[PDB]
Amino acid sequence: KEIGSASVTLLKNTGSLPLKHPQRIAVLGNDATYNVLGPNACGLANSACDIDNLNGTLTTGGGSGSALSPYTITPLEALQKRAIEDNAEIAAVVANSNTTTGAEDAIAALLPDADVTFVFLNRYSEEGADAPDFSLGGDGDNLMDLAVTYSSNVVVVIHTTGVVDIEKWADNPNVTAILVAYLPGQEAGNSLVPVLYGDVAPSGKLPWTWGKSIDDYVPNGVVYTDAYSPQSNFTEGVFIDYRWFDKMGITPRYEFGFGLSYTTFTYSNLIVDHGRWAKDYSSVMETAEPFAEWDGTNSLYDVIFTVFATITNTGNLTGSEVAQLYISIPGDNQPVRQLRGFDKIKDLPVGDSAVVTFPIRRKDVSSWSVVDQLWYVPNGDFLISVGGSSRDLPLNTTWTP
Amino acid sequence: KEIGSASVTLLKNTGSLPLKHPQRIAVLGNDATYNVLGPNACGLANSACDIDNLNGTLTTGGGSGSALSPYTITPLEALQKRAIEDNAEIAAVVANSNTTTGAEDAIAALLPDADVTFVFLNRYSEEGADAPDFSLGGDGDNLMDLAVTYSSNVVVVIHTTGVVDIEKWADNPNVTAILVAYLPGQEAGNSLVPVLYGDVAPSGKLPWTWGKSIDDYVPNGVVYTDAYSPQSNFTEGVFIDYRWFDKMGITPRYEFGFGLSYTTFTYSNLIVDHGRWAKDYSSVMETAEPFAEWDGTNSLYDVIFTVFATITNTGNLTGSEVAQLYISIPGDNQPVRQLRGFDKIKDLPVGDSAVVTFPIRRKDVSSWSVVDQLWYVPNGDFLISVGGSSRDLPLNTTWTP
Ligand SMILES: CC(=O)O[C@@]12CO[C@@H]1C[C@H](O)[C@@]1(C)C(=O)[C@H](O)C3=C(C)[C@@H](OC(=O)[C@H](O)[C@@H](NC(=O)c4ccccc4)c4ccccc4)C[C@@](O)([C@@H](OC(=O)c4ccccc4)[C@H]21)C3(C)C
Ligand SMILES: CC(=O)O[C@@]12CO[C@@H]1C[C@H](O)[C@@]1(C)C(=O)[C@H](O)C3=C(C)[C@@H](OC(=O)[C@H](O)[C@@H](NC(=O)c4ccccc4)c4ccccc4)C[C@@](O)([C@@H](OC(=O)c4ccccc4)[C@H]21)C3(C)C
Ligand SMILES: *[C@@H]1O[C@H](CO)[C@@H](O[C@@H]2O[C@H](CO)[C@@H](O[C@H]3O[C@H](CO)[C@@H](O)[C@H](O)[C@@H]3O)[C@H](O)[C@H]2NC(C)=O)[C@H](O)[C@H]1NC(C)=O
Ligand SMILES: *[C@@H]1O[C@H](CO)[C@@H](O[C@@H]2O[C@H](CO)[C@@H](O)[C@H](O)[C@H]2NC(C)=O)[C@H](O)[C@H]1NC(C)=O
Ligand SMILES: CC(=O)N[C@@H]1[C@@H](O)[C@H](O)[C@@H](CO)O[C@H]1O
Ligand SMILES: *[C@@H]1O[C@H](CO)[C@@H](O)[C@H](O)[C@H]1NC(C)=O
Ligand SMILES: *[C@@H]1O[C@H](CO)[C@@H](O)[C@H](O)[C@H]1NC(C)=O
Ligand SMILES: *[C@@H]1O[C@H](CO)[C@@H](O)[C@H](O)[C@H]1NC(C)=O
Ligand SMILES: *[C@@H]1O[C@H](CO)[C@@H](O)[C@H](O)[C@H]1NC(C)=O
Numbered sequence: 110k111e112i113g114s115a116s117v118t119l120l121k122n123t124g125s126l127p128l129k130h131p132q133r134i135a136v137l138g139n140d141a142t143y144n145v146l147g148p149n150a151c152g153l154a155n156s157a158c159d160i161d162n163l164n165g166t167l168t169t170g171g172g173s174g175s176a177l178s179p180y181t182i183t184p185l186e187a188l189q190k191r192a193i194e195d196n197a198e199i200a201a202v203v204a205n206s207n208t209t210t211g212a213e214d215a216i217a218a219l220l221p222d223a224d225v226t227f228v229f230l231n232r233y234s235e236e237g238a239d240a241p242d243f244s245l246g247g248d249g250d251n252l253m254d255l256a257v258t259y260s261s262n263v264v265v266v267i268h269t270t271g272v273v274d275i276e277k278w279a280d281n282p283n284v285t286a287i288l289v290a291y292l293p294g295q296e297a298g299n300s301l302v303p304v305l306y307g308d309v310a311p312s313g314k315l316p317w318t319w320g321k322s323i324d325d326y327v328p329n330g331v332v333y334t335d336a337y338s339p340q341s342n343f344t345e346g347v348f349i350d351y352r353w354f355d356k357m358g359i360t361p362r363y364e365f366g367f368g369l370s371y372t373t374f375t376y377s378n379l380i381v382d383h384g385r386w387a388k389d390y391s392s393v394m395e396t397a398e399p400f401a402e403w404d405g406t407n408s409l410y411d412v413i414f415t416v417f418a419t420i421t422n423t424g425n426l427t428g429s430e431v432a433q434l435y436i437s438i439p440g441d442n443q444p445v446r447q448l449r450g451f452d453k454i455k456d457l458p459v460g461d462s463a464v465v466t467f468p469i470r471r472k473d474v475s476s477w478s479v480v481d482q483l484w485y486v487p488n489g490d491f492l493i494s495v496g497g498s499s500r501d502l503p504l505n506t507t508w509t510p
Numbered sequence: 511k512e513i514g515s516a517s518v519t520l521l522k523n524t525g526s527l528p529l530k531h532p533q534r535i536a537v538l539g540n541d542a543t544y545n546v547l548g549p550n551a552c553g554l555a556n557s558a559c560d561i562d563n564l565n566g567t568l569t570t571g572g573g574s575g576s577a578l579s580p581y582t583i584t585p586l587e588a589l590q591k592r593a594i595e596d597n598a599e600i601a602a603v604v605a606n607s608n609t610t611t612g613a614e615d616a617i618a619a620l621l622p623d624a625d626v627t628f629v630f631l632n633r634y635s636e637e638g639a640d641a642p643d644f645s646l647g648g649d650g651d652n653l654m655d656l657a658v659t660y661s662s663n664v665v666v667v668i669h670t671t672g673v674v675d676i677e678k679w680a681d682n683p684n685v686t687a688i689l690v691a692y693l694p695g696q697e698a699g700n701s702l703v704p705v706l707y708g709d710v711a712p713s714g715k716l717p718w719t720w721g722k723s724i725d726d727y728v729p730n731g732v733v734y735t736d737a738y739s740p741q742s743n744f745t746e747g748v749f750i751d752y753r754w755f756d757k758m759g760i761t762p763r764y765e766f767g768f769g770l771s772y773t774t775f776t777y778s779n780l781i782v783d784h785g786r787w788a789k790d791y792s793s794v795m796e797t798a799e800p801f802a803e804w805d806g807t808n809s810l811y812d813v814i815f816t817v818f819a820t821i822t823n824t825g826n827l828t829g830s831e832v833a834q835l836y837i838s839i840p841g842d843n844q845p846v847r848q849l850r851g852f853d854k855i856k857d858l859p860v861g862d863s864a865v866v867t868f869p870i871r872r873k874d875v876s877s878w879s880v881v882d883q884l885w886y887v888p889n890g891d892f893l894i895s896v897g898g899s900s901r902d903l904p905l906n907t908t909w910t911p
């Protein structure tokens with residue numbers, strides 16, 4: 110559960126979250142409730158259910174990295190627990206909205222009087238095939254169209270195996286909040302509702318880039334060919350995800366390492382401490398990785414320096430903050446920046462400050478010599494940037510060894 | 511909730527209830543979960559959903575006498591809460607088992623390993639039409655065929671507006687328990703699960719007769735005609751329900767006033783006390799029903815005697831018991847017996863005894879005189895009978911005024 114509550118990521122919030130004590134709650138989407146055939150209906154690999162089946166809350170993906178469930182704690186059941194505590198009413202349409210007789214009529218009638226409308230969306234994928242685009246699973250496009258027609262307070266919650274296309278509605282003023290919650294396992298619903306009701310502020314951030322379009326990603330991501338010897342050439346090199354997005358100058362929807370809270374954090378007092386170094390003595394096994402500065406005592410993974418910064422909860426509510434550190438290694442055709450540290454502060458009171466610390470190892474500031482076939486620390490001007498996301502970096506400094 | 515717990519009526523138990531702490535639980539039937547269109551989707555009179563809609567748990571009937579619901583505490587959600595406390599697993603097939611791709615296979619894969627299989631059945635009906643027969647609503651017949659195919663520990667729970675036909679399954683030894691929970695309103699699951707698990711023994715009993723066949727009841731119960739002036743001739747007279755079965759020598763599957771407990775009760779010490787009479791002063795308003803014994807100072811509703819009996823809990827668990835009193839009023843063309851009292855003893859411990867008391871009013875022992883146009887107490891022998899149902903009557907005596 111605590112994993113779910115720490116992961117769930119807030120992408121948009123025009124004022125609707127956290128919920129106070131809404132009296133009339135509307136829920137949309139089979140994602141909000143059980144698989145109609147049972148949590149384990151899809152079998153040993155969570156891939157045997159029909160393509161149109163209502164599989165319910167998307168708690169894991171398809172294939173060999175799935176597992177059986179003792180139960181699922183559905184969002185609806187958890188939302189209901191909370192409604193009942195508030196002496197409120199709650200109603201869910203969980204059928205296929207396109208194919209079920211009266212579904213659309215029901216939604217039209219249910220939503221206008223709701224204080225808030227949740228829409229649960231999912232996007233299953235699996236081992237054995239690739240997603241054909243950023244397409245919402247089942248009836249999700251429809252759900253969303255209906256929802257914004259009849260309600261001005263839609264809160265979208267996505268259970269997905271990756272980025273999905275929400276371009277149609279993400280800038281609709283009627284969509285007041287959007288959250289992704291990934292694949293939260295069995296404690297799906299009870300990990301989420303605390304966040305929505307504001308018992309714990311959301312603290313999770315995107316572990317990849319949310320581009321406005323599949324066309325903004327590394328070309329030829331999937332090659333389709335009947336050719337007896339199929340060929341993908343990684344001609345983009347090191348430039349995947351936000352590295353690609355950064356180098357090409359492409360603004361995504363939501364950047365790598367982005368995710369809102371219910372409060373704001375102000376960054377301050379950047380500090381690089383050259384005296385804060387230490388030898389790697391802890392790791393279980395060692396590589397035979399070659400590097401310039403090697404002298405028979407030392408390591409690629411020695412922490413050469415350490416960098417510090419200060420966050421201040423400048424908001425109105427307690428909240429956790431994932432601080433990120435990026436470095437610009439100099440060189441030719443070198444990423445605009447690369448993440449070389451993160452430190453999550455837990456539950457920072459309003460007005461309070463905490464120090465963020467980042468141990469930079471040697472390898473963290475090195476390049477591969479193609480010619481000499483070793484790791485070496487380049488010369489040049491290293492940019493160090495610290496902040497909230499891969500594009501929210503209010504503190505830079507420069508280092509030159 | 512409490513009305514639900516006090517009402518649910520146990521019709522069969524081969525040994526499977528109460529549940530201890532089963533580790534693997536299977537659930538069958540859309541009646542186990544929510545209306546897929548929302549609890550109030552059927553609208554202002556619970557009647558506007560499509561004839562095949564999966565309306566979920568039948569918490570009330572259709573028509574002017576229905577009402578909106580602020581939520582539904584589904585059987586599935588209530589059973590799951592117990593599952594979780596027992597560190598167990600629970601899975602529900604709640605689709606239409608005859609029309610949903612995969613449903614039947616999923617049922618076949620799930621049941622054989624389950625420690626217990628619950629099937630939730632329903633039978634909607636509404637103002638404006640009569641049931642065409644006793645058949646189960648939706649896919650209930652199919653669920654019951656499937657269940658007894660793949661599981662030897664099937665427990666059946668019926669949400670219904672009246673008697674249904676379960677003659678195919680009720681004497682199948684794979685059906686280990688059968689309960690009817692009628693129409694429990696918004697607290698459907700949390701009322702039922704305490705009874706199954708044995709936090710409270712079941713104490714409800716049937717408020718009508720449950721015949722093997724619709725053919726066993728009063729003939730011409732629903733007249734179907736296009737005649738301009740349709741006629742229903744009540745030639746049966748007072749002989750409806752158990753009066754019909756009793757007089758005509760027909761054996762029901764479960765008689766009027768039948769319901770099992772998790773313990774047994776022995777009856778003793780029938781006492782008819784002619785000294786224990788009382789004048790009627792408690793009515794809010796009075797009738798002007800003529801009666802023969804009227805002396806200006808008395809009333810058809812005076813209690814004229816009181817009968818007592820004793821019940822003892824002769825089993826091994828605490829139970830509540832509804833004790834019933836019937837009187838054979840003598841005369842031409844008279845019901846074999848007529849209910850004239852009931853008394854529910856609450857939570858009688860093992861070994862303990864309690865006294866059951868039954869005030870008998872003058873009207874309770876009277877007949878109407880067509881010739882004289884007044885009520886009178888006939889001459890002859892009155893048989894007074896006491897017991898646990900209309901056919902389980904261990905105690906009797908004759909009163910001859
Ligand atoms: C083919 C394959 O990927 O097999 C394995 C078995 O170990 C492999 C690794 C894989 O992790 C594993 C266990 C999985 O967990 C997958 O999620 C998984 C799959 C990806 C899936 O794979 C497929 O559907 C195959 O492409 C499919 N193959 C073909 O039909 C095929 C024919 C000609 C050319 C190429 C392919 C297949 C389907 C059903 C039974 C056997 C093979 C089979 C498989 O049943 C599962 O496979 C079997 O259970 C199985 C395979 C062969 C014989 C008997 C059983 C699958 C599941 C569980 C559904
Ligand atoms: C016919 C009837 O019972 O009407 C009422 C309106 O007050 C009546 C009392 C009744 O208890 C009440 C409120 C109900 O709650 C019923 O559950 C109820 C019904 C039984 C239902 O009525 C029927 O099914 C009638 O048999 C049905 N009969 C006919 O269509 C019919 C027409 C001409 C000649 C012969 C028969 C009907 C349907 C729809 C509108 C009017 C009549 C209408 C009705 O909308 C509901 O009716 C209306 O809402 C309504 C009726 C007439 C005009 C406008 C609205 C119904 C509901 C709520 C669905
Ligand atoms: C509910 O879960 C189902 C898995 O148990 C899922 O079905 C599977 O969906 C994928 C698409 O994500 C299908 O993928 C394949 O589609 C055709 C196969 O002929 C190929 O062109 C593709 O390359 C791809 O491999 C699976 O076929 C499908 N599995 C089955 C057995 O039908 C449902 O889609 C899920 N429901 C929803 C609404 O998301
Ligand atoms: C679900 O509820 C609906 C009513 O809201 C039921 O459909 C009615 O069923 C009766 C028969 O009992 C028909 O006379 C009506 O025409 C039906 N209503 C409409 C508008 O179609 C439906 O049968 C219930 N579901 C199940 C499976 O019993
Ligand atoms: C001849 C006649 O009036 N009989 C009607 C019948 O036509 C109608 O289908 C049914 C339900 O509407 O109600 C019956 O009373
Ligand atoms: C927003 O919702 C309202 C109903 O509350 C609807 O009238 C309006 O068309 C919607 N607008 C957009 C931009 O979807
Ligand atoms: C991609 O691979 C094909 C297959 O050998 C090759 O002909 C083509 O020139 C390659 N292009 C690159 C590496 O950019
Ligand atoms: C009862 O269940 C078993 C499987 O558990 C099945 O093989 C058997 O045929 C069933 N018997 C009846 C009478 O349905
Ligand atoms: C119903 O009763 C009337 C009056 O006795 C009678 O004329 C009519 O035939 C009866 N209908 C029957 C016999 O079902």
Ligand SMILES: OC[C@H]1O[C@H](O)[C@@H](O)[C@@H](O)[C@@H]1O
Binds near residue numbers: 734735
């Ligand atoms: O119209 C079909 C059906 O309607 C009502 O249920 C009655 O009037 C039936 O006798 C008739 O069969």
